[PDB]
Amino acid sequence: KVTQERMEQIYEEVKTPYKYGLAVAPTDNYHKIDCPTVFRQGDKWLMTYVVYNGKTGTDGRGYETWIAESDNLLDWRTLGRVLSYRDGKWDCNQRGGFPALPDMEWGGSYELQTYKGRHWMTYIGGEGTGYEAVKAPLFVGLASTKGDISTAHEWESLDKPILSIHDKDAQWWEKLTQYKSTVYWDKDKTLGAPFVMFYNAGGRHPETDLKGERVGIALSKDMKTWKRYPGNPVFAHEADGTITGDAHIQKMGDVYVMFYFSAFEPSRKYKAFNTFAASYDLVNWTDWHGADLIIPSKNYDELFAHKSYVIKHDGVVYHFYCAVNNAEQRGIAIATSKPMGRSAVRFPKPET
Record's family (predicted)? Predict the structure, then answer.
């Protein structure tokens, strides 16, 4: 267990009280933008994000992954797609990606690392249309590129998922569908493998029959072949329909900090939010006992303020998150550790 004192120090280190506002927003009501991953190459900042091209649960085709660039972490310009609808394949309708092998050092380079001369990415893949898993389940895919990661070009992908709910070795907590994943390079082989995947998935608890989304680990020596951690899930909050997910891990000294979101948690009077946990061993997680890091509080995030990517750079913490309002407009916003101005980006006028 991480001490209360150390948990309080981590909170003071990572907090972002000051909402800059939207970073990336849809220009109409029939697109939704989510799932930031921020990284650096040279002195350019890059963000991958997913786009759903519908207003409702069923009108859109599904996820594509786009990339945007920035010089200052605040002002962003969209470049184009990096994972597009892939006709004739298992993932033809859902392609929502999450770059892999980030430098995990808190306040470090924020670069993506190479393996076998390539950059890597995992993704939400599936053949159902609509929003996420409404028509069909979602599985974990693997992508990679030998290209320049600062360019909107198509990354290459496998013709089978790397993990799926139908696998012989699939566990109870992931039987319904898989959701976000992120693969880390663990130099220390803390869990007996160099590649450690943190992912969230839906299932039913074998004792209580409660449905929810929970976080677990998968392990690999080559990016291609994966085994589940036998002790999965490693982080969950047990209530009816509660979501725990989008685990985002950075190493701060001798401790790992997991930024995560939760939704439909009974102990909160807002519907979705970000907080953190910490661990020395990647498996046993101590939950923060204080105020949540990001909560609904502005027009633009009044329903959900949730999902994390966190950059500490030049003495300032930038917490990227997905903002959803009561009209269910969806985009990516930023909060910071000191005021950094105000975004000029707005959502479109909502539909009546």
Answer: Belongs to the glycosyl hydrolase 2 family.
SS3 241: coil
> Which residue range forms the structural domain that includes residue 257?
1-352
Q: Is 159 exposed, middle or buried (0-12, 13-18, 19+ CB in 10 A)?
A: exposed
Buried b (16+ CB within 10 A) or exposed e, 3-33: eeeebeebbeebbbebbbbbbbbbeebebbb
Helix (H) or strand (E) holding 109: none
Q: Which two tokens stand for residue 173?
A: 């907590």
Cis-peptide into 233, omega within 30 deg: yes
Instruction: Give 262's contacts (C-beta < 8 A, 6+ positions apart).
Output: 237, 242, 243, 244, 245, 268, 272, 273, 275, 306
Cα dihedral 7→252→107→110 (10° resolution):
-120
| Residue 50: φ, ψ to 5° | -105, 150
Tally of domains in the chain: 1
Resolution, Å (one decimal): 1.4
Dihedral (CA of 125, 128, 132, 138) sign: negative
Q: What is the experimental method?
A: X-ray
